[PDB]
Amino acid sequence: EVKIMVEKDPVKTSFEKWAKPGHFSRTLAKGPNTTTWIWNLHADAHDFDSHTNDLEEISRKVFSAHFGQLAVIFIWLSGMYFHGARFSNYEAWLSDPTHIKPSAQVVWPIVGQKILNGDVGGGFQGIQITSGFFQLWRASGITSELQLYTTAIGGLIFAALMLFAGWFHYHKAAPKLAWFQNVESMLNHHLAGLLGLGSLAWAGHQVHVSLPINRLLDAGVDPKEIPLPHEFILNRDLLAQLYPSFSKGLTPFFTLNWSEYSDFLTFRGGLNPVTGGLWLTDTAHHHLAIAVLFLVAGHMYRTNFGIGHSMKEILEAHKGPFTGEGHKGLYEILTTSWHAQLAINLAMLGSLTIIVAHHMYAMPPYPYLATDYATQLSLFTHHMWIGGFLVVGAAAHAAIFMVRDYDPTTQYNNLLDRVLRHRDAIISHLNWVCIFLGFHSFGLYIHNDTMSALGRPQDMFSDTAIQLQPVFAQWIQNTHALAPSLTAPNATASTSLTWGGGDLVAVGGKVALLPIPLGTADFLVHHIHAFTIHVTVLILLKGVLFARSSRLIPDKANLGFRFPCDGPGRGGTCQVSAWDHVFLGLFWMYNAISVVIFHFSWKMQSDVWGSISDQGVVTHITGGNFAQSSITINGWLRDFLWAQASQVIQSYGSSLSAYGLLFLGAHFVWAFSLMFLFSGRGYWQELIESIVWAHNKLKVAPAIQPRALSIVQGRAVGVAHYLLGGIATTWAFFLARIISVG
Amino acid sequence: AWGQDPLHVRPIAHAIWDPHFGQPAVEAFTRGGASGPVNIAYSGVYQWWYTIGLRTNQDLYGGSIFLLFVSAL
Amino acid sequence: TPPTLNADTPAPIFGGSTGGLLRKAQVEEFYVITWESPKEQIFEMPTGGAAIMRSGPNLLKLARKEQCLALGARLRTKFKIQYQFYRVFPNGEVQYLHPKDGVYPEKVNAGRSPVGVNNRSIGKNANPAELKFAHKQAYDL
Amino acid sequence: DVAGLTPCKESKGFAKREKQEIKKLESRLKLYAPDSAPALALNATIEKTKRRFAFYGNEGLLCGTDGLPHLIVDGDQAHLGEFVYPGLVFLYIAGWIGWVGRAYLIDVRTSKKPTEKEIIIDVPLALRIMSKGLTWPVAAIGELRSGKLVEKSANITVS
Amino acid sequence: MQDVKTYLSTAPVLATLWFGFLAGLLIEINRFFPDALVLPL
Amino acid sequence: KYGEKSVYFDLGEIDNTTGNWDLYGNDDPNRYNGFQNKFFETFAGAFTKRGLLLKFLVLGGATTIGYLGSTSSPDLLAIKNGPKQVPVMGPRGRK
Amino acid sequence: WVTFYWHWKHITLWQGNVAQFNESSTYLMGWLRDYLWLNSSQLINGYNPFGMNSLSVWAWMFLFGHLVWATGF
Amino acid sequence: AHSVKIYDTCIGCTQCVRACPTDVLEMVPWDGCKASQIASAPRTEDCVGCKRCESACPTDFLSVRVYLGAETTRSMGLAY
Ligand code: CLA
Ligand SMILES: CCCCCCCCCCCCCCCC(=O)OC[C@H](COP(=O)(O)OC[C@@H](O)CO)OC(=O)CCCCCCCCCCCCCCC
Ligand SMILES: CCCCCCCCCCCCO[C@H]1O[C@H](CO)[C@@H](O[C@H]2O[C@H](CO)[C@@H](O)[C@H](O)[C@H]2O)[C@H](O)[C@H]1O
Ligand SMILES: CC1=C(C/C=C(\C)CCC[C@H](C)CCC[C@H](C)CCCC(C)C)C(=O)c2ccccc2C1=O
Ligand code: SF4
Ligand code: SF4
Numbered sequence A: 001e002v003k004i005m006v007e008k009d010p011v012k013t014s015f016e017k018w019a020k021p022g023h024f025s026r027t028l029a030k031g032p033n034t035t036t037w038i039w040n041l042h043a044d045a046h047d048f049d050s051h052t053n054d055l056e057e058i059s060r061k062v063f064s065a066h067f068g069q070l071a072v073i074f075i076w077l078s079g080m081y082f083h084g085a086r087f088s089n090y091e092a093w094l095s096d097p098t099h100i101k102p103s104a105q106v107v108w109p110i111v112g113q114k115i116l117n118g119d120v121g122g123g124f125q126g127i128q129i130t131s132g133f134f135q136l137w138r139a140s141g142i143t144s145e146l147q148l149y150t151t152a153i154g155g156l157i158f159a160a161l162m163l164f165a166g167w168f169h170y171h172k173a174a175p176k177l178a179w180f181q182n183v184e185s186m187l188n189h190h191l192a193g194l195l196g197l198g199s200l201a202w203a204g205h206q207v208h209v210s211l212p213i214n215r216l217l218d219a220g221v222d223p224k225e226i227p228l229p230h231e232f233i234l235n236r237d238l239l240a241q242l243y244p245s246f247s248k249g250l251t252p253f254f255t256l257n258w259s260e261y262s263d264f265l266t267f268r269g270g271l272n273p274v275t276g277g278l279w280l281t282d283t284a285h286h287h288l289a290i291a292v293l294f295l296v297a298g299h300m301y302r303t304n305f306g307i308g309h310s311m312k313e314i315l316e317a318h319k320g321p322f323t324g325e326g327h328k329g330l331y332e333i334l335t336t337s338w339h340a341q342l343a344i345n346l347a348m349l350g351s352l353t354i355i356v357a358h359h360m361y362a363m364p365p366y367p368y369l370a371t372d373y374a375t376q377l378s379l380f381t382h383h384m385w386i387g388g389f390l391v392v393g394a395a396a397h398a399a400i401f402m403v404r405d406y407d408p409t410t411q412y413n414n415l416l417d418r419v420l421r422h423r424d425a426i427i428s429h430l431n432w433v434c435i436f437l438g439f440h441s442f443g444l445y446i447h448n449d450t451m452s453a454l455g456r457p458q459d460m461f462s463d464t465a466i467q468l469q470p471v472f473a474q475w476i477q478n479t480h481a482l483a484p485s486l487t488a489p490n491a492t493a494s495t496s497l498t499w500g501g502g503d504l505v506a507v508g509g510k511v512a513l514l515p516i517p518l519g520t521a522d523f524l525v526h527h528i529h530a531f532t533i534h535v536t537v538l539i540l541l542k543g544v545l546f547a548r549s550s551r552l553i554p555d556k557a558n559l560g561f562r563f564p565c566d567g568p569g570r571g572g573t574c575q576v577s578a579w580d581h582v583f584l585g586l587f588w589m590y591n592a593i594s595v596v597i598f599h600f601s602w603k604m605q606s607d608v609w610g611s612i613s614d615q616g617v618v619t620h621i622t623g624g625n626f627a628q629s630s631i632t633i634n635g636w637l638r639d640f641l642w643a644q645a646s647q648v649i650q651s652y653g654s655s656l657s658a659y660g661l662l663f664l665g666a667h668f669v670w671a672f673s674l675m676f677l678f679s680g681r682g683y684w685q686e687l688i689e690s691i692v693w694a695h696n697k698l699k700v701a702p703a704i705q706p707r708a709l710s711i712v713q714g715r716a717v718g719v720a721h722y723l724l725g726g727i728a729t730t731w732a733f734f735l736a737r738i739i740s741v742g
Numbered sequence B: 001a002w003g004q005d006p007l008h009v010r011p012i013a014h015a016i017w018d019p020h021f022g023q024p025a026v027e028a029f030t031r032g033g034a035s036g037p038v039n040i041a042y043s044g045v046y047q048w049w050y051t052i053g054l055r056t057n058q059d060l061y062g063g064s065i066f067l068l069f070v071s072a073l
Numbered sequence C: 001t002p003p004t005l006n007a008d009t010p011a012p013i014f015g016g017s018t019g020g021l022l023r024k025a026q027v028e029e030f031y032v033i034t035w036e037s038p039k040e041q042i043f044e045m046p047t048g049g050a051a052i053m054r055s056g057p058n059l060l061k062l063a064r065k066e067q068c069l070a071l072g073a074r075l076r077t078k079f080k081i082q083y084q085f086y087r088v089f090p091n092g093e094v095q096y097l098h099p100k101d102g103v104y105p106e107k108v109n110a111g112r113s114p115v116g117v118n119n120r121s122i123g124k125n126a127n128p129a130e131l132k133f134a135h136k137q138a139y140d141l
Numbered sequence D: 001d002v003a004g005l006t007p008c009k010e011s012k013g014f015a016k017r018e019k020q021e022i023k024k025l026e027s028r029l030k031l032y033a034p035d036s037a038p039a040l041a042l043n044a045t046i047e048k049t050k051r052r053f054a055f056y057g058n059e060g061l062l063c064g065t066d067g068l069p070h071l072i073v074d075g076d077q078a079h080l081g082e083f084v085y086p087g088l089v090f091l092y093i094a095g096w097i098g099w100v101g102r103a104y105l106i107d108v109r110t111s112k113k114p115t116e117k118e119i120i121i122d123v124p125l126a127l128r129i130m131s132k133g134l135t136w137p138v139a140a141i142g143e144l145r146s147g148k149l150v151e152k153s154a155n156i157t158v159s
Numbered sequence E: 001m002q003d004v005k006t007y008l009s010t011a012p013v014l015a016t017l018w019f020g021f022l023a024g025l026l027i028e029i030n031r032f033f034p035d036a037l038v039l040p041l
Numbered sequence F: 001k002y003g004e005k006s007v008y009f010d011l012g013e014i015d016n017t018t019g020n021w022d023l024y025g026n027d028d029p030n031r032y033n034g035f036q037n038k039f040f041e042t043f044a045g046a047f048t049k050r051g052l053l054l055k056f057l058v059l060g061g062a063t064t065i066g067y068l069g070s071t072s073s074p075d076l077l078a079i080k081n082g083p084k085q086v087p088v089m090g091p092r093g094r095k
Numbered sequence G: 001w002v003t004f005y006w007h008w009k010h011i012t013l014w015q016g017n018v019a020q021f022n023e024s025s026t027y028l029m030g031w032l033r034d035y036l037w038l039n040s041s042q043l044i045n046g047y048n049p050f051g052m053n054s055l056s057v058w059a060w061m062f063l064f065g066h067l068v069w070a071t072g073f
Numbered sequence H: 001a002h003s004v005k006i007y008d009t010c011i012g013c014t015q016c017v018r019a020c021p022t023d024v025l026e027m028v029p030w031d032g033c034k035a036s037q038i039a040s041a042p043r044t045e046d047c048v049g050c051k052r053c054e055s056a057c058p059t060d061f062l063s064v065r066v067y068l069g070a071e072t073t074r075s076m077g078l079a080y
Helices: A036-043 A055-086 A090-095 A133-140 A145-172 A183-219 A236-242 A244-248 A280-297 A311-317 A330-336 A338-362 A373-404 A415-421 A423-453 A471-481 A520-545 A578-607 A633-644 A657-677 A681-696 A711-741 B023-028 B045-051 B057-072 C023-027 C065-079 D014-029 D037-059 D084-109 D114-119 D123-131 D136-146 E002-008 E011-032 F034-048 F050-071 G002-015 G018-024 G028-039 G056-072 H015-019
Strands: A006-008 A103-105 A125-128 A173-175 A511-513 A610-612 A618-620 B012-015 B038-040 C030-037 C041-044 C050-053 C056-062 C083-088 C094-096 H003-007 H026-029 H037-040 H064-067
Touching: A055 A103, A055 A133, A055 A145, A055 A173, A055 A338, A090 A133, A090 A145, A125 D037, A133 A183, A145 A173, A183 A236, A183 A280, A236 A244, A311 A330, A330 A338, A330 A415, A338 A373, A373 A520, A373 A578, A373 A711, A415 A423, A423 A520, A423 A633, A423 G056, A511 A610, A520 A578, A578 A618, A578 A633, A578 A711, A633 G056, A657 A711, A657 G028, C030 C065, C041 C065, C056 C065, C065 C083, D014 D037, D084 D114, D084 D123, D084 D136, E002 E011, F034 F050, G002 G018, G002 G028, G018 G028, H003 H037
Parallel strands: none
Antiparallel strands: A006 A173, A103 A125, A610 A618, B012 B038, C030 C056, C030 C083, C041 C050, C083 C094, H003 H064, H026 H037
């Protein structure tokens, strides 16, 4: 059943189609008549399933394109490593991590760009970076530029290998359709190899390289005097000097005396006091345990050898008296349509990225990362934005599947049909939830504003006035803080210092982590988050469920996935397509993520980050004003945007001037998007008619007829420039402020 | 009072009767020589009326009654 | 042609939905579409979901004329099935509507009279200023 | 002089600004080793600033109260280099690019498939047309006088 | 090779080459003739 | 809905056909006590007429609102209490 | 644009510091920093956790306007 | 209560009739075109105003025109 099936030389390698711009489409291949052709060409390029109708070619194209993206990522990684090997102060930073600002980008002297080369320290001039690569390299045990250069060369070699593999598997030996549909074998191989073996290999690297080097670095040994990584493998005496249990070899492993390895495979919470990061011995036991768990999990599904579970039978077995046929029919959908798989994977990847952001600020895994405030803020905001984008894409491509690949014949009385049959109730109840949340949270904010303006602060929803405490979150914090005594007795400390119990970790006169109190303002802000998230879900789910039909337009599935309207009739049918629902969900996702990152920035600056002096007295960056000033909209406007933007607007003439320039440019681009968002196509078409007359009067009219952008293109351009402007504004603001005060 | 000292008195537009106020607002909005919360006028009608010969409150009352009559007409 | 009547024919096998009739059908008109099938088949309901059509006559209540016509168009272009639909009023009056003379509208048939045809180009219409303070619309002329 | 503006060399505030910039650069320089690369870069910036200020002062620019140069564009003979000369150079270059673009469009218009040459440029023909743009004003006046520059029968809408 | 020449004549590629050459020329001019505010001639 | 078979359309039963049912309507006539009904029909029956109810509601609301507004004690309303502190001078010495 | 220009020029004239306008009006960051951010201080401090001023109504109207303008979108 | 007009530039390709979602249009025998048929709009009371007929008409300018007017429970496309 499961076997390798390929075709020899399916597509001939030639440059002939490179001279046919629209070869992939049967309508675009005829050439252009209007300027719409160019946009259609660049818009339909990578939409493979609209060109052909057979799954084999689509699957082969997807495989090769994924090879290409892998090659691009390898080029990017090689570039980062090389630019850190040649244009950085990584060694000087290694000597003095707490005073040297990381820097890996250097600008040329041309038009006054000199001012951007700041005094980051270590006898170096360059742009301060916030990607956190220095901390990752230090945790990996890298102590020289030669190792980084070797890694860059290896990355380039891997990029070449990925390019060759993509060419090979498209133009020379293309797998057949039966090869791609081996989902059981794919899950077995990926889940066991890619995850378990990769985690086991990283655990091996940590145990054999990173533990001794970082142990010596934390002790105080100068980086130039530390022996090279292979000297701990060729001479086990050194590694036994650092961790004495290595002197026993692998005998405790095979005799099940695993407690002998307890000095480098620990289970201890908290952070390293010297570096303010997680202990690397815990990271060793945990990448090892993850490897074991994934390797066990990967031997589950049935393949050529009889044993194992079959996913089709499992899906067909779980059904009950409330859901008719249950999960029947999903296997064919998920082995027949790429779009359903894309939707599921995008949703999971976005949620996982958001989880990564939370867990990474709460438990800083790298040395000297917690006390580098700019890196923490940058990483959190970046991966949060990425997760939001991915979760919106999930809904987009799920709606694409519903419009194109849905087949009512296969889905008679399963979960999909019954979901499509009670959609009005779902949307109605979710509408009520959105309205209820919006009122009882934002109205609380407006009530606070009005009470404060009227001179009645005793009638507000504040800690000193009427209180709204988050009792459930407080109880969860207290429970998690007392785990190392009752429910996880083998732990030394709690999972993170953010729980109520614990102490303060300070590295170089700066607070790394600290217990985070939760009060009325935190109650308000999490319920704001809940409001925005349920509203975004409402928009996207309404788009997905009503993608095929409604009461307004019974035959919406005939018009396609991406169409502007169905005319001015029935009162007006603008934006009835699932594409426009994604178009609005993008705006609401932007709103939600902006509120989330603002909450994170203000709360951290006000209650966690700060400078500590003798006698253990803590002074925070904004002096704990979040609890009192964040309960009002005026409080936000005055004490966050007005107060914290002083750095970006005063950065002219310093090394931070680029941040102010991009601050202004982003406000500009965001404003510029409104002219595409607020207007329509007919006005611009008529104006273009007049301009075309002007060009015609001088015999210089173009052969390709100019046309106004289509309706869908107008919406897409508006939303793209809008998102770019807003996100770049926040980027410049955050980076300027946190580089100045961090 | 404004006519007596034009450069040191703030003109008053209309009084305030808002049941939703608290005491600090009542203290804060008592400007001019008023006995209660008031609004300071920014329309410039004090200067315009003073320049054209109006001097007392009876003049303004007579003007108001006359304009009522004109609107009725 | 003599317009057909209505009878008591079985409905398709459907499990229910929230996209069905509402109070408008109770206090206003609602529509019924009839067709004959050679075999039981699964088709997509215009209101959302999948149903099974019976072998022989079928009858279906719908809330709008557009729903009936969309379902009939799909039936004709996908199953090669002829169909009729009517309009029902609350008092019991039944109005036969789609194949008004038994021939589908895209086929020219004798006995049909033009309605709304103007014997000029669209550019020969008059000016709104000429018909000022008059009830004409310059396309009714 | 003009509009009560003083020359840059005579003005105080120009020299004050130069002193302030040099002082800031030297204050930055105080942190590095004398022979290191940052010191050399900062010294290069300092020399460039000195040269720029000397050139601006010696070129004959008027200076405002705030100490910054101002431009005169009313046609004065003493300030032609501020506006008129760069304006003429730009007009020449822009006329060149526009004229060669129009010539290429006209030459492509009579082809088997003008749109294909509209997206995929005929490089040899384009190079020939581009090289013939040196004397664009003469050709432009020639076609203006010859009556081959404008059109008379063009598409319009309902008036 | 004819197909390669035809591909290299497409609008995006030619625009990239032309704007790269123009940007390089302007950058080199500003490297050798910097801080030019008024035209000396 | 004739209901005999999969037939759900029947011109004879148009209320069943259109789904015009009473989901929870209950027609049991005995709910309350006789003397309760006597008392409530005697007293609450005055407001049955609707135009008189409108007039009474408007006049009563206006009278109540005016009386409460014009007779509220200063210790309850801050607007009637008035200022109690010395006024603050303006920026340029303008009062 | 017209009213911004008039207001900033007259603010600088009335404060006696015309040099700030003469120097900061030639670039857009000058506008954003020295007009709006600089002159919004007392406005946004109309009411705070420490009490309220007579500018409380104007701060409330400022937020109200930002909100209605947003709602139009 | 929209109004649909047909003009004498019609060629009788029948695309508008096929595009109509509410069966407002129909073909009528005619003389004046090679197809010898023209479109008619007898059921204008059922027109919703979608203007699919106008999108389907091949002619310099449209031979079928829709003029939006008074709105009705059928024109508004209400299922409730
Ligand atoms: C142990 C075996 C193994 C391993 C390691 C992988 C690993 C991977 N597969 Mg995969 N796959 C396997 C078996 C395996 N597969 C089998 C048996 C099937 C058929 C049922 C598939 C079918 C399949 C498809 C259809 C696709 C993948 C894709 C991917 C990549 C996902 C992107 C990623 O995680 O980037 C992380 C990257 C790395 C960790 C770098 C790893 C270094 C190289 C790439 C390891 C290559 C392993 C490979 C099996 C070796 C082939 C042998 C060849 C040299 C002769 C990843 C490299 C996707 C992809 O991106 O395609 C390229 C994709 O679309 N796989
Ligand atoms: C380095 C990594 C790889 C880079 C690309 C390598 C491409 C190798 C050849 C691919 C095509 C294989 C099939 C050949 C056959 C093919 O493609 O079509 C076949 C076709 C035949 O044309 P003829 O006129 O010779 O024959 C026509 C017949 O009808 C009668 O003979 O064209 C060729 O033979 C040209 C082959 C080279 C075409 C590309 C030339 C330029 C390539 C390099 C471009 C960059 C140069 C940079 C220099 C610094
Ligand atoms: C998957 C494997 C990847 C790596 C492949 C290469 C592995 C190389 C490391 C394996 C050798 C382990 O080395 C470990 O035992 C060696 C003896 O066997 C010891 O070697 C010691 O004894 C040897 C004689 O046996 C002497 O020649 C050495 O001078 C002495 O140092 C090392 O001090 C110890 O660190
Ligand atoms: C501004 C605007 C336009 C007009 C904008 C147009 C026509 C886009 C123009 C894009 C660029 C500027 C075209 C560039 C053409 C060539 C690539 C130029 C080559 C030569 C050099 C400049 C490289 C619309 O068509 C439109 C349509 C629907 C909703 C909103 C709007 C809208 O807001
Ligand atoms: S306004 Fe635009 S989107 Fe809306 S119905 Fe008219 S053409 Fe369609
Ligand atoms: S507008 Fe729509 S409903 Fe009206 S005639 Fe045209 S296609 Fe038919």
